[PDB]
């Protein structure tokens, strides 16, 4: 019947074009409650299914300082979505895949839509959609807002995947960081979190404005400024080299 889907992605990767292509005129250019930040919501039907699509603000990352990131992350973490579509620029995927990893660590249902695939075709690129799926462990679809390719296939994956029985091991951050994560996880075991403890741990150690402060209120130790920076750089670096590897394998 009703499927609620969030469109996440960096800025300028074709997220808005894809939104428009899926919903056509059946959309509103509204705003997030109390602020001027644009919020596009739309609807489309596929095989007797209604999909309510919400476009989230473009974000290169999901921290908690800028209004865009706070809004996008708030909806992902504290929101209503049944699954997420990570919109990636198929010509320059690095930054999109980095964002993807952050969301996979949230343990949300994700589909990767590689958009602007006609531009990738034209530049002579070779992208192996099946290689990507193997690496990332999620459905991957090639789409083009310009030619309309992959659009109906994406809708297919949305309804199929949304009603499919639900990505638990993702990234190894080295013994030091992994041990700290475990220590944090143990501490939170008896707490009633609304997100998995591993993600909480990564963001707390990393000094995220919301997760660090909250973690300390729950009784976790305070961290120096150097520690929080240290943890965040290491975590970022690991994500990066993972991304570079995926690209090395799936992009020829």
The answer to the question of whether 57 is labelled as a binding residue is yes
Query: Is 105 labelled as part of a ligand binding site?
Result: no
Q: Is 184 annotated as a binding residue?
A: no
16 is known to lie in a ligand binding site:
yes
Q: Is 197 annotated as a binding residue?
A: no
* 109 annotated binding-site participant: no
- Domain positions in the chain are 1-166, 167-251
Is 68 annotated as contributing to ligand binding?
Answer: no
Q: Residue 238 corresponds to which tokens in the numbers above?
A: 């690991």
DSSP string, the chain: -EEEEEEE--TTSSHHHHHHHHHTTSEEEEE-TTS-SEEEEEEEEETTEEEEEEEPPP-SS--SSSHHHHHHHHHHHHS--SEEEEEEESSS-HHHHHHHHHHHTTT--EEEEEE-HHHHHHTT--B-HHHHHHHH-S-EEE--TTT-TTHHHHHHHHHHHHTS---------HHHHHHHHHHHHHHHTTS--SS-HHHHHHHHHTT-HHHHHHHHHTTPPP--HHHHHHHHHHHHHHHHHHHHHHHHHHB-
Class in CATH terms, 1-166: alpha beta
**Annotated binding residue 252:** no
Would you say domain 167-251 falls under CATH 1.10.287.1770? yes
CA gap 223, 56 in Å, rounded:
32
Q: Distance between CA atoms of 20 and 26, rounded to whole angstroms?
A: 9
User: Is 201 annotated as a binding-site member?
Assistant: no
Cα 69 to Cα 4, 157, 167, 169, distances in angstroms:
20, 27, 24, 25
For the purposes of burial, counting CB atoms within 10 Å of the CB of 217, is it exposed (0-12), middle (13-18) or buried (19 or more)? exposed
């Amino acid at each position: 019947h009703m499927v609620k889907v969030a469109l996440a992605g960096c800025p300028n990767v074709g997220k808005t074009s894809l939104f428009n292509a899926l919903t056509g005129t059946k959309q509103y250019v509204a705003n997030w409650p109390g602020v001027t930040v644009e919020k596009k919501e739309g609807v489309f039907t596929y095989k007797g299914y209604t999909i309510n699509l919400i476009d989230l603000p473009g974000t290169y990352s999901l921290g908690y300082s800028s209004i865009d990131e706070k809004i996008a992350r708030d909806y992902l973490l504290k929101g209503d979505a049944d699954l997420v579509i990570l919109v990636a620029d198929s010509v320059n995927p690095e930054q999109s895949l980095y964002l993807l990893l952050e969301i996979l660590e949230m343990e949300k249902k994700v589909i990767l839509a590689m958009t602007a695939i006609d531009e990738a075709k034209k530049t002579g690129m070779k992208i192996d959609r099946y290689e990507l799926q193997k690496h990332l462990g999620i459905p991957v679809v090639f789409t083009s807002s310009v030619t309309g390719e992959g659009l109906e296939e994406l809708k297919e994956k949305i309804v199929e995947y949304a009603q499919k029985n639900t990505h638990r091991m993702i990234l190894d951050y080295g013994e030091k960081v992994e041990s700290e994560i475990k220590k944090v996880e143990n501490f939170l075991r008896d707490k009633k979190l609304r997100i998995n403890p591993r993600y909480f741990a990564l963001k707390y150690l990393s000094g995220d404005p919301e997760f660090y402060s909250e973690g300390v209120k729950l009784g976790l130790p305070e961290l120096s400024e150097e520690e929080r920076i240290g943890y965040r750089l290491l975590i970022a670096k690991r994500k990066r080299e993972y991304v570079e590897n995926v690209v090395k394998e799936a992009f020829a």
